[PDB]
Amino acid sequence: AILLPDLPYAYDALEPYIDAETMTLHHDKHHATYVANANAALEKHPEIGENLEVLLADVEQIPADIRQSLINNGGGHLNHALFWELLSPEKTKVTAEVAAAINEAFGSFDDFKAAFTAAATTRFGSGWAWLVVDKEGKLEVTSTANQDTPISQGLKPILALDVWEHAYYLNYRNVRPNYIKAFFEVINWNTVARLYAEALTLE
Amino acid sequence: AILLPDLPYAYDALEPYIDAETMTLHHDKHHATYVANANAALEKHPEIGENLEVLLADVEQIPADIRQSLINNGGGHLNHALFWELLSPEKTKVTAEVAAAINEAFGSFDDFKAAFTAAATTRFGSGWAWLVVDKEGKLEVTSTANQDTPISQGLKPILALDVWEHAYYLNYRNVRPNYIKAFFEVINWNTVARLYAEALTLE
Ligand SMILES: [Fe+3]
Ligand SMILES: [Fe+3]
Numbered sequence: 001a002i003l004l005p006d007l008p009y010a011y012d013a014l015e016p017y018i019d020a021e022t023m024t025l026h027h028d029k030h031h032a033t034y035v036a037n038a039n040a041a042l043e044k045h046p047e048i049g050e051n052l053e054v055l056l057a058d059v060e061q062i063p064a065d066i067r068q069s070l071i072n073n074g075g076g077h078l079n080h081a082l083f084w085e086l087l088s089p090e091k092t093k094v095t096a097e098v099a100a101a102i103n104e105a106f107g108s109f110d111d112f113k114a115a116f117t118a119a120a121t122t123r124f125g126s127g128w129a130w131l132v133v134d135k136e137g138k139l140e141v142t143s144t145a146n147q148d149t150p151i152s153q154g155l156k157p158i159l160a161l162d163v164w165e166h167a168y169y170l171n172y173r174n175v176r177p178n179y180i181k182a183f184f185e186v187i188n189w190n191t192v193a194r195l196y197a198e199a200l201t202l203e
Numbered sequence: 204a205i206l207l208p209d210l211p212y213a214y215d216a217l218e219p220y221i222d223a224e225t226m227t228l229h230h231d232k233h234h235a236t237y238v239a240n241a242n243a244a245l246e247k248h249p250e251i252g253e254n255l256e257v258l259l260a261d262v263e264q265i266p267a268d269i270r271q272s273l274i275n276n277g278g279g280h281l282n283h284a285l286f287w288e289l290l291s292p293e294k295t296k297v298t299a300e301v302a303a304a305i306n307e308a309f310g311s312f313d314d315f316k317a318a319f320t321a322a323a324t325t326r327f328g329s330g331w332a333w334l335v336v337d338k339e340g341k342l343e344v345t346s347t348a349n350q351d352t353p354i355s356q357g358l359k360p361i362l363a364l365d366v367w368e369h370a371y372y373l374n375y376r377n378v379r380p381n382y383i384k385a386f387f388e389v390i391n392w393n394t395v396a397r398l399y400a401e402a403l404t405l406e
Contacts, residue, residue: 025376025377029376029377030377033377072327124275124349124350125328125329125330125348125349125350125367126328126329126368127328145328146327146328147327147328164328164329164368165329165367165368165369165372166368166372166377169368169369169372169373170372170373173228173232174228174232174233174236174369
């Protein structure tokens with residue numbers, strides 16, 4: 001079965017940037033529901049196994065009667081698992097190779113941060129802003145709807161911000177760009193490095 | 204210019220079903236923002252005018268370069284303006300003709316309630332649950348994404364529930380069902396009758 005991973009720090013470790021009550025519901029309620037629903041969907045078709053990253057890379061392989069529910073809850077599970085690991089109570093620095101890849105893709109770091117901030121601002125409704133590695137090994141900023149994940153288009157995400165309202169409403173209310181800025185404070189760039197390394201090597 | 208209509212009651216009027224603070228952010232920030240954005244798009248084409256209900260009934264007729272912004276913000280404005288009129292601090296009752304059409308399409312009021320509750324609850328991500336008049340004059344429950352509106356498909360809304368998280372997170376957190384059950388205590392059935400009469404009387 002899919003399991004709910006633990007937060008690898010205390011619920012309040014990201015304060016004042018993300019508030020402990022949000023971390024608690026976001027993980028114990030929202031995330032747990034994605035895992036519970038993904039298990040129920042998968043229980044229905046044991047023959048397909050449970051490797052979500054493989055199943056959701058090509059959604060039409062998933063039998064029709066559970067497809068949208070797996071996209072939604074199976075995607076909710078993967079997006080959130082990735083998200084907890086990209087957050088750090090301790091400040092970190094963009095790694096040399098990650099930084100170099102950025103200048104190359106965007107021209108400078110501030111250009112990236114601005115392209116990223118804007119994909120996150122203008123994602124209308126519920127969804128996620130992403131930094132991804134191309135099938136060409138290049139970086140792109142994108143944004144997806146709801147729990148849709150870029151791995152469904154063969155893109156490898158190395159950074160991700162959740163812009164569903166539940167992620168920021170208790171701390172920032174309507175002011176999503178305040179929450180976006182706060183995110184840059186608590187990114188775990190070591191996770192980003194590892195994801196990006198894993199992106200290139202498995203290619 | 205599109206104007207932000209005033210709430211037709213005090214902000215704390217829907218208490219304890221909807222909290223004051225939410226009414227306040229929801230109208231003063233969320234709806235104001237759609238109104239502002241809708242106007243910025245419209246001003247780029249003064250020739251197409253300001254009749255949002257006509258423009259959004261055929262989206263395709265809207266110049267490509269403001270079409271998405273119009274759908275989202277224009278849609279945002281209609282749905283919300285409709286939403287404030289549908290809420291009532293006084294418990295009202297279902298008008299006889301409305302009750303009868305609900306009995307006909309659904310079996311009983313409570314059947315309708317469960318069905319509208321199902322659409323409101325399973326809408327994944329941001330959106331709206333609706334009771335609409337068919338092209339054939341029949342009632343149907345549906346839901347839509349984000350700020351999409353059933354008038355875009357030649358359906359006439361007579362009941363609407365915002366299921367965006369900003370509509371309910373302050374008072375109910377992740378438990379959208381408690382929000383939905385509460386919405387039924389504050390429905391203005393007189394706004395529903397009136398919309399229902401209007402839908403039948405333009406065909
Ligand atoms: Fe989330
Ligand atoms: Fe709303």
